[PDB]
Structures are given as structure tokens and as C-alpha cells.
Amino acid sequence: NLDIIGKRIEKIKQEHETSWHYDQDHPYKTWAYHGSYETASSMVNGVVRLLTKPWDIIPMVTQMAMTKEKVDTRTQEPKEGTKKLMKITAEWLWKELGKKKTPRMCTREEFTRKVRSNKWKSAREAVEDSGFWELVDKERNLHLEGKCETCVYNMMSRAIWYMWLGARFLEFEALGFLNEDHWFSRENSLSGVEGEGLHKLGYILRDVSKKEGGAMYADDTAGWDTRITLEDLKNEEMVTNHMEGEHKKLAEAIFKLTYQNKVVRVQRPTTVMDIISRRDQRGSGQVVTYGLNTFTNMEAQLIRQMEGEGVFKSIQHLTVTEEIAVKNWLVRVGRERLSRMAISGDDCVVKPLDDRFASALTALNDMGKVRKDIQQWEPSRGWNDWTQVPFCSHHFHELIMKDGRVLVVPCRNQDELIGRARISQGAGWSLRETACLGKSYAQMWSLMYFHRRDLRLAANAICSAVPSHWVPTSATHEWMTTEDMLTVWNRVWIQENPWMEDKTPVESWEEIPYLGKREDQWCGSLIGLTSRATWAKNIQTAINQVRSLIGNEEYTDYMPSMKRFRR
Ligand SMILES: O=C(c1ccco1)N1CCN(C(=O)C2CC2)CC1
Ligand SMILES: [Cl-]
Ligand SMILES: [Zn+2]
Ligand SMILES: [Zn+2]
């Protein structure tokens, strides 16, 4: 333990030798405390808020802009039968994921290009300073030597662990391939959805619905990242078994020194910097966190499926022939069972063979993946209709175009969409940068949420209010473009859509349908309210208010793309 974390602890004690104090009133039980030393609210987007006036009196919108007891927890050691199921399943899953992919190191060039597209002031500055890279080299050579000096986390149902850019590089070099080479694409992982836009996710859920079987289950885990066991981290580490030479050694060091042993500096108002350590839980880059969460979720859900199908009798202990049965299940039907699932990190949808899955809870609870908002042994409540299943914060509607073609569209409560577009993060936004962020939300709404009456109108208004040539600023983001949004809509929903056989382009926005008016209201629309009527009728006055603030620029009127403003 301290042989792996001591050097990092020693180095920090020195940069604060006139403060090091072993507080005895420390608030840590599950985190090991080592010592102490002496040591970003949401802003409103004015462009979006001025063009969404009716929502100024909707508390579900307005409260979103205003204003850890789970990290300090301890998950128990799984039983021996549970550990066997996880090791057999993880071994088989890394082999399947690796059948058509080659693990490889990511490069300083790739890392530099990422930072250049979002002592040293910023990341862009450090990437260019050859002094930085000489620091990376020292740490790198130390990792090859099996030791760590500078890979330390900083803390800040969310908890984000920043490290310095150098440590982030070493993580990206060893494990970036998982994301950069799409190991969790649907084509490669079967259950995954990595690189699938919101315009794909509903079609994927409808394809899972077409399988014979039981209800669709979408159980959320209570604090997934806090329930990652040291056994989970050891099964995730087995990806290094597919690696070779240097890469194998560099990846092994990231898992050993930074994931399976962690050093964290947390601020305590009491102000002292708390240097704490622990072996378990998730604490990695957010992108590596997504892939390893997807992997360990796919494993956990296949084991729950095995439990429901009776592949093993008890988690207490696998018999020798139960192990052969688990292996033979994976080889015989593993790829089919993966295709019965849609898994995005800690978020899953599973269509099992039948509803025995609902009460198959012993492995899931013993792995520590305890379900949110339900008693530990109460059977899961499944969904009978793919259009009601929650996934990635959405549900999905089946929408038939006047010409008979079928759109499967993403949806969520409209107060959440408007309340999020009204918020910026960070300081020093110019009026132009605030306008270009509003334009990014407006174009996302035109592409993904065109079927919501209020959002198509508000999107058209924002795009009318912001200069036509200004570039939108700050999954697939096809809305981040200055191309005409009708041309982008045709490319995404018709041309490139593998579920649409007839490729006839749409010639105008009037061909593109809305939800039913009652369904639009059920999902949050203000259609029918006097306020919404006054907003819609007077929208050119709101557009002109924003144009007057931005000043004398080139603007386009997009409002006559809608039937009601077309004379
Ligand atoms: O519900 C609707 C409507 C508009 C489009 C589809 O349905 N309306 C018409 C506009 N309205 C008004 O002008 C009334 C003064 C509020 C409210 C009733
Ligand atoms: Cl249902
Ligand atoms: Zn290190
Ligand atoms: Zn909806």
C-alpha cells in the first residue's frame, strides 16, 4: 500500500512542510487520511432567456439556474461464486471486444490535437512547452519502473477527479484506444452505443423490442462509481492481457498505481487540504470512466441474465460443471444476449429471454450494483412498450411523416430542455460567444427536437436573432455547423439513416411532422396557454430586441419556414 502511494504523499508533504498537520478530528472513515496543509456557479444565457419569455414564470425552468456522503462508503467483498462468474465473464468479454480491434498506444500528437480543439496558464500552453514533456518522460520512466510520483487526484450524484495534464496524458497514452478506436461501438460490442447520436438510440431500442422475450428492464444503480469493487478493477485490468511490449507495461502501471491505489487532495472548510487514499471505487478520466463503466455494466447484466436463465444455482460457490456451463452459455449464446441490451456506461436497457430476470437479484446485489428507488429484494418493474423505456435521460416516440416514412425521435420533459439551454458555465463570455452558444442549443433543437412545437419555434427565433454566419460554440454533434439545418436534417434522418429505405429528400420544414398536440402537452409543451400564444404571435418583436442588443449585423428571418408565419 504505502509502498505505492508513499512517494506521492512524501512529495506533497514537502511542498507544504510549513503546514503539514495530522489532524485528529478528520471526517474520513472509509478513506485513509494521511495529513493536511494550508490552502463555479451556473450563469444565465441572456440570448436564450430573452427568446423564451413564457418560461420566466415556470419554476421547473427558473430554479435550474439557481444555487459527499456517498464517496465515504464501503462495498463488501463479493462471495466466491460471484467472483468466479465475474472473472469468467470478463475474460470472455475482453476476448470478444478484441476479436476485431488491436489495442495500441495513443500519441502526443493525438493528445496535442485534442487540447488544441478543446507554470503554464492553459493546456494549449503546456502541450507546446517541451519542459512539460520532459516531466511526462520522468513519470513515464517511473511507471515502467513500477512507481508513481505526480499522478494525484483532486476532488470537486456527481464527483469529478481532475489530475494535472501530464497524468491525463499517461492515462490517454495507455487506455485512450478504448474510446479513440470505438471498442464500445454497437458493431463491435453488440450492447454498446458509443458514437450513436440521440437520433440512433430510439431505433436501437425499437430493434431490441423486436426480440422475443420478456419486459424491457431499465434499472438505475444507486451511485454506480461508488459501487465499483477492487474485484471489478482487477477484471477491467485484464484488457492488458491483450497488449504487448511497452504498452502492456504502461497500461499495467495506470491500473496498479492510479486506479487500484488512489491519492486524492480534498478541500475541507474546517481550510486544510486533505490528502486521502483508497483502493476501490471509480476515479479515472471521464472518457476512460465511460468505457470501463460500459464494460463492467455489460458483464453484470450478462450475469443477471445467466441467473434468470438458471445457468448457476447459487453465488455462494460455483461447482466445476457450473463453470463449464457458464463458459458454454457464453460461447453458445453470449453474443445473442449482448444484442438484447443497450448499455451506455452505468445506464442499461435489457430485454431478457423472459421475466425470471425481474427476481434474479442475488448476483446483482452481491456484486454491489444495488438498484436505486426499490427495496433490495423487490422484483424489478419492467416496461411493456419500448416508447416508455427511459435511456440516456430520454424516451423515444414513433412519428409517421405525412408521406408514410417512420421517424423514431428522442424526447424529454420540455422544461428540462429549456432550463438547460438558459445556462452557461464559466466567466468572461462576450455577447457574441453567448449568442453562438444559444445558436448551438437552437440547432440541436432543430435536429433532435423538431417534433416539439415550442422548440421548433424557439430554435427558428434564436437562429433569426443571431447573425446568420456566426459559428455555433461549445454521441454525435451534427448541429455544430454553419450548413443549412434543412440540409443537415436530410443527411441525418434520411440519407445516412439505415432504418429509412426510401431516400427521397424533404424539400421544406413543413414536410417534417410534430408529435400529436396532446402528446406535446404531456411532454411539457405550453401550447394552449395564453402566454405561449402571445409569445408566438409577437415573436418578431423578441427577435428584434435581441438583434438591437447585438447590433447592425447580417441576419436571416427563419420564421416563414413555419406555416403560421408564411403570410
Ligand atoms: O391551442 C391553441 C393552438 C394553437 C395551435 C394549435 O393549438 N390555441 C390557439 C391559440 N390560442 C389563442 O390565441 C388564445 C388566446 C390564447 C389558444 C388556443
Ligand atoms: Cl409500459
Ligand atoms: Zn504516476
Ligand atoms: Zn416525449
UniProtKB/TrEMBL annotation:
Q: Which residues bind Zn(2+) 2?
A: 395, 397, 411, 523
Binding, Zn(2+) 1:
139, 143, 148, 151
Q: Extract the coiled-coil ranges from the record.
A: none
The segment(s) forming the RdRp catalytic domain are 214-360
**Residues that coordinate or bind Mg(2+) 1:** 220-221, 346
| Domain of life, per lineage | Viruses
Residue positions binding Mg(2+) 2: 220, 347
UniProt: CTP binding residues:
158, 223-225, 293, 372
Please explain the role this protein plays, according to its UniProt record.
Answer: Regulates the ATPase activity of the NS3 helicase activity. NS4A allows NS3 helicase to conserve energy during unwinding. Plays a role in the inhibition of the host innate immune response. Interacts with host MAVS and thereby prevents the interaction between RIGI and MAVS. In turn, IFN-beta production is impaired. Interacts with host AUP1 which mediates induction of lipophagy in host cells and facilitates production of virus progeny particles. Required cofactor for the serine protease function of NS3. May have membrane-destabilizing activity and form viroporins.
Subunit notes for this chain? Homodimer; in the endoplasmic reticulum and Golgi. Interacts with protein prM. Interacts with non-structural protein 1.
Give the protein name, as stated in the record.
Genome polyprotein
Range within the parent protein: 2764 to 3382 of 3391
